[PDB]
Short mmCIF file of C-alpha atoms and ligand atoms in Angstrom, two decimals:
data_model
loop_
_atom_site.label_atom_id
_atom_site.label_comp_id
_atom_site.label_asym_id
_atom_site.label_seq_id
_atom_site.Cartn_x
_atom_site.Cartn_y
_atom_site.Cartn_z
CA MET A 143 -48.32 8.71 -10.18
CA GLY A 144 -46.54 7.84 -6.92
CA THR A 145 -44.65 5.98 -5.52
CA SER A 146 -43.17 3.46 -7.99
CA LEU A 147 -41.49 0.88 -5.74
CA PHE A 148 -43.20 -1.80 -3.66
CA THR A 149 -42.42 -4.61 -1.21
CA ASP A 150 -44.45 -7.66 -0.20
CA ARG A 151 -45.17 -8.60 3.42
CA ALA A 152 -44.72 -12.37 3.17
CA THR A 153 -41.65 -12.32 0.92
CA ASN A 154 -40.60 -8.65 0.93
CA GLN A 155 -39.55 -8.66 -2.73
CA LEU A 156 -39.06 -5.42 -4.67
CA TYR A 157 -41.27 -4.25 -7.56
CA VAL A 158 -40.65 -1.34 -9.94
CA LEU A 159 -43.08 0.34 -12.37
CA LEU A 160 -41.82 0.10 -15.96
CA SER A 161 -43.49 2.57 -18.34
CA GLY A 162 -46.92 0.95 -17.98
CA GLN A 163 -46.60 -2.35 -16.12
CA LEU A 164 -44.34 -3.42 -13.25
CA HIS A 165 -41.39 -5.81 -13.07
CA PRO A 166 -39.91 -7.57 -10.03
CA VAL A 167 -36.27 -6.78 -9.19
CA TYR A 168 -33.35 -8.57 -7.49
CA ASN A 169 -32.22 -5.67 -5.31
CA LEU A 170 -33.03 -2.12 -4.18
CA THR A 171 -29.92 -0.85 -5.96
CA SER A 172 -31.12 -2.01 -9.38
CA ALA A 173 -34.50 -0.38 -8.74
CA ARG A 174 -32.99 2.97 -7.75
CA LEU A 175 -30.87 2.55 -10.88
CA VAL A 176 -33.69 1.94 -13.36
CA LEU A 177 -35.73 4.74 -11.79
CA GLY A 178 -32.94 7.32 -11.63
CA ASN A 179 -33.50 8.45 -8.05
CA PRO A 180 -33.03 7.12 -4.50
CA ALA A 181 -36.60 6.39 -3.39
CA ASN A 182 -37.79 3.84 -0.82
CA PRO A 183 -40.18 0.93 -1.51
CA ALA A 184 -43.75 0.83 -0.19
CA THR A 185 -44.78 -2.24 1.82
CA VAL A 186 -47.85 -3.77 0.19
CA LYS A 187 -50.38 -6.59 0.54
CA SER A 188 -49.73 -9.35 -2.02
CA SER A 189 -53.25 -9.09 -3.48
CA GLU A 190 -52.39 -5.62 -4.80
CA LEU A 191 -49.46 -7.10 -6.72
CA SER A 192 -51.73 -9.93 -7.86
CA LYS A 193 -54.36 -7.73 -9.51
CA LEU A 194 -51.89 -6.39 -12.07
CA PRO A 195 -50.37 -7.34 -15.46
CA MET A 196 -46.87 -8.13 -14.19
CA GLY A 197 -43.77 -8.19 -16.38
CA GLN A 198 -40.63 -10.05 -15.29
CA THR A 199 -37.41 -9.63 -13.29
CA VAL A 200 -34.93 -6.92 -14.31
CA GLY A 201 -31.81 -5.29 -12.87
CA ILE A 202 -28.51 -6.74 -11.67
CA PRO A 203 -28.28 -10.12 -9.87
CA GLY A 204 -24.84 -9.96 -8.23
CA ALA A 205 -25.33 -6.32 -7.23
CA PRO A 206 -25.45 -5.19 -3.59
CA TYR A 207 -28.90 -4.94 -1.98
CA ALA A 208 -28.45 -1.28 -1.09
CA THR A 209 -25.60 1.22 -0.98
CA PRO A 210 -25.15 2.49 2.60
CA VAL A 211 -22.06 4.52 3.48
CA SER A 212 -20.21 5.80 6.57
CA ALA A 213 -18.66 9.26 6.96
CA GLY A 214 -15.54 11.39 6.60
CA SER A 215 -13.49 13.28 7.72
CA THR A 216 -10.57 10.92 7.07
CA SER A 217 -10.06 8.63 4.10
CA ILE A 218 -7.75 6.07 5.71
CA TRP A 219 -6.63 3.01 3.73
CA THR A 220 -4.13 0.51 5.14
CA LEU A 221 -2.75 -2.73 3.67
CA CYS A 222 -1.15 -5.15 6.12
CA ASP A 223 0.86 -8.32 5.59
CA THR A 224 0.79 -10.53 8.67
CA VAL A 225 2.92 -13.68 8.63
CA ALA A 226 2.43 -17.10 10.23
CA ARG A 227 5.27 -19.62 10.62
CA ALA A 228 7.97 -16.97 10.14
CA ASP A 229 10.59 -19.71 10.59
CA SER A 230 9.07 -22.63 8.68
CA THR A 231 9.81 -23.89 5.17
CA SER A 232 6.82 -23.64 4.11
CA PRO A 233 5.79 -20.31 5.64
CA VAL A 234 2.54 -18.45 4.91
CA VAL A 235 1.47 -14.80 4.70
CA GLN A 236 -2.05 -13.65 5.58
CA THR A 237 -2.82 -10.23 4.10
CA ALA A 238 -5.60 -7.77 4.97
CA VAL A 239 -7.05 -4.39 3.97
CA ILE A 240 -8.39 -1.76 6.38
CA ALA A 241 -10.64 1.22 5.61
CA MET A 242 -11.37 2.17 9.21
CA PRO A 243 -9.40 4.53 11.51
CA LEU A 244 -6.29 2.89 12.98
CA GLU A 245 -5.06 2.21 16.51
CA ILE A 246 -1.32 2.78 16.13
CA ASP A 247 0.98 2.50 19.16
CA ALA A 248 4.57 1.41 19.78
CA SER A 249 3.83 -2.26 19.15
CA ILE A 250 2.78 -1.38 15.60
CA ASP A 251 4.36 1.82 14.39
CA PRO A 252 6.00 3.16 11.23
CA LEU A 253 9.60 2.07 10.67
CA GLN A 254 12.21 4.43 12.10
CA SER A 255 14.85 5.61 9.62
CA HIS A 256 17.29 2.89 10.69
CA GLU A 257 15.20 -0.28 10.84
CA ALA A 258 14.09 -2.31 7.82
CA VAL A 259 12.37 -5.54 6.80
CA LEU A 260 14.09 -8.27 4.79
CA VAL A 261 11.63 -9.63 2.22
CA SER A 262 11.41 -12.17 -0.62
CA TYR A 263 9.35 -12.01 -3.81
CA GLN A 264 9.53 -14.13 -6.99
CA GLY A 265 12.92 -15.63 -6.17
CA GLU A 266 14.47 -12.19 -5.77
CA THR A 267 14.95 -10.57 -2.37
CA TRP A 268 14.05 -7.01 -1.39
CA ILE A 269 14.34 -4.73 1.64
CA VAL A 270 11.53 -2.56 3.00
CA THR A 271 12.01 0.84 4.61
CA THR A 272 9.62 3.69 5.42
CA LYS A 273 9.84 4.91 1.83
CA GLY A 274 9.32 1.59 0.06
CA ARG A 275 11.13 -1.43 -1.33
CA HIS A 276 14.72 -1.66 -2.56
CA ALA A 277 16.27 -4.51 -4.55
CA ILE A 278 19.02 -6.48 -2.81
CA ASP A 279 21.11 -9.66 -3.10
CA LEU A 280 21.36 -12.34 -0.41
CA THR A 281 23.60 -14.66 -2.44
CA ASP A 282 26.84 -12.66 -2.45
CA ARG A 283 27.69 -13.89 1.04
CA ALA A 284 30.17 -11.17 2.04
CA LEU A 285 28.38 -8.36 0.19
CA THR A 286 25.41 -8.81 2.52
CA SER A 287 27.48 -8.66 5.71
CA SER A 288 28.96 -5.29 4.71
CA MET A 289 25.91 -3.47 6.09
CA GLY A 290 24.93 -4.71 9.55
CA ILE A 291 22.80 -7.58 8.24
CA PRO A 292 24.30 -11.09 8.18
CA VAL A 293 23.09 -14.13 6.26
CA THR A 294 21.81 -15.70 9.47
CA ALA A 295 18.88 -13.37 8.81
CA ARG A 296 16.79 -14.73 5.94
CA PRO A 297 14.02 -12.87 4.05
CA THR A 298 10.30 -13.53 4.37
CA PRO A 299 7.47 -13.86 1.77
CA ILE A 300 5.32 -10.91 0.67
CA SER A 301 1.98 -10.74 -1.17
CA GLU A 302 1.56 -9.29 -4.67
CA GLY A 303 -0.63 -6.37 -3.60
CA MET A 304 1.86 -5.52 -0.87
CA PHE A 305 4.72 -5.66 -3.36
CA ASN A 306 2.87 -3.39 -5.80
CA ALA A 307 1.83 -1.01 -3.03
CA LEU A 308 5.45 -0.38 -2.08
CA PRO A 309 7.09 2.28 -4.29
CA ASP A 310 10.28 0.85 -5.78
CA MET A 311 12.82 3.36 -4.47
CA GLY A 312 15.51 1.81 -6.67
CA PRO A 313 18.08 -0.70 -5.38
CA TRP A 314 20.25 -0.49 -2.28
CA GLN A 315 23.87 -0.73 -3.54
CA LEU A 316 26.40 2.12 -3.29
CA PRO A 317 26.71 4.01 -6.63
CA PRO A 318 29.35 2.88 -9.17
CA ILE A 319 32.91 4.18 -8.99
CA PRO A 320 33.81 3.96 -12.71
CA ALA A 321 37.45 5.05 -12.41
CA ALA A 322 38.17 3.23 -9.12
CA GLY A 323 41.83 2.32 -8.66
CA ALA A 324 43.34 4.86 -11.05
CA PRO A 325 45.98 7.32 -9.72
CA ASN A 326 44.17 10.11 -7.86
CA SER A 327 44.31 13.36 -9.84
CA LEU A 328 43.77 15.79 -6.96
CA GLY A 329 47.23 15.99 -5.38
CA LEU A 330 46.53 13.74 -2.39
CA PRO A 331 48.96 10.94 -1.38
CA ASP A 332 49.15 8.40 -4.20
CA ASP A 333 48.22 5.51 -1.92
CA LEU A 334 45.04 7.46 -1.18
CA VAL A 335 43.98 6.50 -4.70
CA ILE A 336 40.62 7.23 -6.35
CA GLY A 337 37.71 5.45 -4.68
CA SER A 338 39.47 5.41 -1.32
CA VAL A 339 37.92 6.56 1.96
CA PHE A 340 39.57 9.06 4.30
CA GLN A 341 38.50 10.71 7.56
CA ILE A 342 38.56 14.21 9.02
CA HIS A 343 37.72 14.86 12.68
CA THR A 344 35.22 17.73 12.87
CA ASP A 345 33.43 19.28 15.87
CA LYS A 346 30.94 16.39 15.82
CA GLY A 347 33.11 13.31 15.32
CA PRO A 348 34.90 12.14 12.16
CA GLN A 349 33.83 12.92 8.60
CA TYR A 350 34.36 10.37 5.84
CA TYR A 351 35.08 11.16 2.20
CA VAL A 352 35.42 9.16 -1.00
CA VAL A 353 38.01 10.25 -3.54
CA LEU A 354 36.04 10.75 -6.76
CA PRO A 355 37.39 11.55 -10.25
CA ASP A 356 35.81 15.02 -10.07
CA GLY A 357 36.42 15.84 -6.41
CA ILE A 358 35.71 14.39 -2.98
CA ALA A 359 32.37 13.21 -1.59
CA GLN A 360 31.00 13.30 1.96
CA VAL A 361 29.58 9.99 3.20
CA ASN A 362 28.12 8.55 6.40
CA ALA A 363 30.10 5.99 8.43
CA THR A 364 27.99 3.10 7.12
CA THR A 365 28.74 4.02 3.51
CA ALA A 366 32.43 4.34 4.39
CA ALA A 367 32.40 0.88 5.97
CA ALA A 368 30.57 -0.63 2.99
CA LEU A 369 32.93 0.99 0.48
CA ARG A 370 35.96 -0.24 2.41
CA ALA A 371 34.47 -3.73 2.63
CA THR A 372 33.97 -3.72 -1.14
CA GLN A 373 37.44 -2.33 -1.81
CA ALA A 374 39.82 -0.76 0.71
CA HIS A 375 42.60 -0.27 -1.85
CA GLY A 376 45.33 -1.73 0.36
CA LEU A 377 44.40 0.54 3.26
CA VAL A 378 43.90 -0.90 6.75
CA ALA A 379 42.36 2.18 8.34
CA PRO A 380 40.96 5.24 6.51
CA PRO A 381 43.97 7.63 6.58
CA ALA A 382 43.26 10.62 8.82
CA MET A 383 43.42 13.98 7.04
CA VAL A 384 43.61 17.51 8.42
CA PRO A 385 40.99 20.07 7.19
CA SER A 386 43.45 22.48 5.53
CA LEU A 387 44.29 19.85 2.90
CA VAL A 388 40.82 19.29 1.45
CA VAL A 389 39.47 22.69 2.50
CA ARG A 390 40.24 23.86 -1.04
CA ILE A 391 39.23 20.71 -2.93
CA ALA A 392 35.88 20.64 -4.75
CA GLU A 393 33.10 19.06 -2.70
CA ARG A 394 30.92 16.55 -4.55
CA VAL A 395 27.81 14.45 -3.90
CA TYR A 396 27.60 10.66 -3.67
CA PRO A 397 24.00 9.28 -3.46
CA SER A 398 24.41 6.26 -1.12
CA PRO A 399 21.02 5.06 0.21
CA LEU A 400 22.59 3.66 3.39
CA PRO A 401 21.31 5.25 6.63
CA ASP A 402 23.65 7.28 8.84
CA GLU A 403 22.39 5.18 11.74
CA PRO A 404 23.10 1.44 12.06
CA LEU A 405 20.67 -0.98 10.40
CA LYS A 406 18.05 -2.67 12.58
CA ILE A 407 16.65 -5.63 10.64
CA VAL A 408 13.32 -6.33 12.30
CA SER A 409 12.52 -9.85 13.48
CA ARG A 410 9.50 -11.02 11.49
CA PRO A 411 8.59 -13.59 14.15
CA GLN A 412 8.69 -10.92 16.87
CA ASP A 413 7.37 -8.30 14.43
CA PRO A 414 5.01 -10.09 11.97
CA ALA A 415 2.92 -7.12 10.79
CA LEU A 416 4.17 -5.19 7.76
CA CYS A 417 1.68 -2.56 6.59
CA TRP A 418 1.29 0.30 4.10
CA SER A 419 -0.86 3.19 5.30
CA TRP A 420 -2.51 5.76 3.02
CA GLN A 421 -4.10 8.98 4.23
CA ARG A 422 -5.99 12.06 3.10
CA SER A 423 -7.57 14.23 5.80
CA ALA A 424 -9.75 16.56 3.74
CA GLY A 425 -7.58 19.17 2.04
CA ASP A 426 -5.97 18.56 -1.34
CA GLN A 427 -2.37 18.16 -0.09
CA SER A 428 -0.82 14.83 -1.10
CA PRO A 429 -1.39 11.20 -0.09
CA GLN A 430 0.65 10.17 2.95
CA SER A 431 2.14 6.75 2.23
CA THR A 432 3.95 5.27 5.22
CA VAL A 433 5.22 1.75 5.91
CA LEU A 434 4.46 0.31 9.34
CA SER A 435 6.01 -2.60 11.23
CA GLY A 436 4.68 -4.28 14.35
CA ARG A 437 3.28 -7.20 16.31
CA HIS A 438 -0.36 -6.96 15.26
CA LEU A 439 -2.88 -5.19 13.03
CA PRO A 440 -3.07 -1.42 13.71
CA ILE A 441 -6.68 -1.70 14.93
CA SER A 442 -8.52 -2.40 18.19
CA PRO A 443 -8.83 -6.01 19.44
CA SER A 444 -12.56 -5.47 18.90
CA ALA A 445 -11.99 -4.65 15.24
CA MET A 446 -10.36 -8.07 14.85
CA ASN A 447 -13.92 -9.39 15.17
CA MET A 448 -14.93 -7.52 12.01
CA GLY A 449 -12.59 -9.33 9.63
CA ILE A 450 -14.48 -10.51 6.56
CA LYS A 451 -12.35 -13.14 4.84
CA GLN A 452 -13.28 -12.51 1.21
CA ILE A 453 -14.72 -15.87 0.13
CA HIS A 454 -13.51 -15.79 -3.48
CA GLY A 455 -11.11 -12.98 -2.64
CA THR A 456 -7.50 -12.17 -1.82
CA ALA A 457 -7.55 -10.54 1.62
CA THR A 458 -9.47 -10.19 4.88
CA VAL A 459 -11.44 -6.93 4.89
CA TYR A 460 -11.81 -4.72 7.96
CA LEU A 461 -14.47 -2.14 7.21
CA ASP A 462 -16.53 0.43 9.12
CA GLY A 463 -19.69 0.49 7.02
CA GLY A 464 -19.94 1.25 3.31
CA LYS A 465 -17.65 3.57 1.37
CA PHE A 466 -17.98 5.76 -1.71
CA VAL A 467 -14.56 6.13 -3.31
CA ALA A 468 -12.96 7.99 -6.21
CA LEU A 469 -9.63 6.91 -7.68
CA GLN A 470 -7.07 8.66 -9.91
CA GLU A 471 -11.74 9.73 -12.44
CA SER A 472 -12.93 6.15 -11.98
CA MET A 473 -15.44 5.83 -9.14
CA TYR A 474 -16.37 2.81 -7.01
CA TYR A 475 -18.81 1.84 -4.28
CA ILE A 476 -17.60 -0.42 -1.48
CA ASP A 477 -20.29 -2.42 0.32
CA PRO A 478 -19.91 -3.45 4.02
CA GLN A 479 -18.76 -6.87 2.78
CA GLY A 480 -15.67 -5.30 1.23
CA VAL A 481 -16.60 -5.60 -2.44
CA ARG A 482 -15.98 -2.88 -5.04
CA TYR A 483 -18.72 -2.18 -7.57
CA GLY A 484 -17.86 0.11 -10.48
CA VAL A 485 -19.73 3.40 -10.63
CA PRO A 486 -19.28 4.87 -14.16
CA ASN A 487 -20.47 8.45 -14.69
CA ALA A 488 -21.19 11.24 -12.20
CA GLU A 489 -24.83 11.27 -13.30
CA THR A 490 -25.23 7.60 -12.37
CA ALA A 491 -24.14 7.95 -8.74
CA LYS A 492 -26.80 10.63 -8.27
CA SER A 493 -29.46 7.94 -8.71
CA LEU A 494 -28.02 5.92 -5.82
CA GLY A 495 -28.03 9.08 -3.70
CA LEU A 496 -24.24 8.92 -3.54
CA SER A 497 -22.24 12.15 -3.25
CA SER A 498 -18.69 13.33 -2.49
CA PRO A 499 -16.68 10.14 -3.15
CA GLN A 500 -13.57 10.01 -0.94
CA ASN A 501 -10.13 9.66 -2.51
CA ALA A 502 -8.70 6.16 -2.14
CA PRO A 503 -5.45 4.55 -3.33
CA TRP A 504 -6.03 2.30 -6.34
CA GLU A 505 -3.15 0.17 -5.06
CA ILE A 506 -5.41 -0.93 -2.20
CA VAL A 507 -8.89 -0.68 -3.71
CA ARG A 508 -7.82 -2.94 -6.59
CA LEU A 509 -7.37 -5.85 -4.16
CA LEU A 510 -11.07 -5.69 -3.32
CA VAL A 511 -13.41 -8.09 -5.11
CA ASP A 512 -14.46 -6.52 -8.40
CA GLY A 513 -18.23 -6.93 -8.48
CA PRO A 514 -20.64 -5.94 -11.28
CA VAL A 515 -20.83 -2.41 -12.70
CA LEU A 516 -23.75 -0.24 -11.58
CA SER A 517 -25.07 1.11 -14.88
CA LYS A 518 -28.45 1.71 -16.50
CA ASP A 519 -27.67 -0.60 -19.42
CA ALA A 520 -26.80 -3.55 -17.19
CA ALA A 521 -29.85 -2.97 -15.00
CA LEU A 522 -32.12 -3.54 -18.00
CA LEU A 523 -31.88 -7.31 -18.50
CA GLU A 524 -35.04 -9.41 -18.24
CA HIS A 525 -35.08 -12.78 -16.47
CA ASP A 526 -37.67 -15.47 -15.70
CA1 LIG B 197 9.32 -0.20 15.51
#
């Protein structure tokens, strides 16, 4: 009848009452687990512990001592790839995860819809925009130069977690023109064959169109340039057309991922930080995935002194206190050291006094060190 948890004065070790007699315990977490409620230990003179038929140690060894947690408000989760020696041989990428509010400026901001990051992963190159990653080839020497980028710009390494965090928004590459070259069946000049590009001067500059088998397709100047570079069909300049010719021809759509603006390949030495931010204010809404580029980590210079390089881990963890997170659900507790411990059922977390687990992206939380699983079965193992 108590009271069921005690601490010594000389050693301050935790003791829990089991049915009739007490057992010592590795951590407070295991005690609050085996009890089923978040109660605090009672400091006690060693002689009290002495005059008692003691059992032996139970609980979970590699479990966190306690389970403290910060607040929210926001559930911010960022994953940054910083790069050292961005012109070596022999380069190296230092990655990091952030679960604290960010300090975003103009030296580390999300990519504008015209700038992108050349990247390399598993022998195959990719390109990163605000949306995600797109497959690309840097071997076809001329094919690369068709869109702003040269070959004098080489890609740069990227971590696995970063690669898997970026949604594969397909490849770059202008869509296939299956009938390209065949006599145009729309009445236009025969030298303006299918797959050719022509221009019409509207009220806001010229407008470029590709001759498709089932009509004509509006494209941005970059797509026009790329198409012409691939195949111009014996045409020096895209033949100017006057509106009243195609004003009656069926208008069609041509995907083309190329931006209307020119392409600004960021300089990884001058812009080493490549991050993926994930947000959820409070309302249901949807997660807000955005890719950032910059000079440094999107946190305060002070926060840089909070980086816990995971000893047997993958990334440096920047963390403002403990977190209680829910994926998908599958729930986890993150200790201030940046280690995820599995929290099974909803009834279990009530013992640790944990409530309202924030939503967090599994893409980021999975990079955290997977510790033991906080369960009642695992917390019932005797040791000498
Ligand atoms: Ca920028």
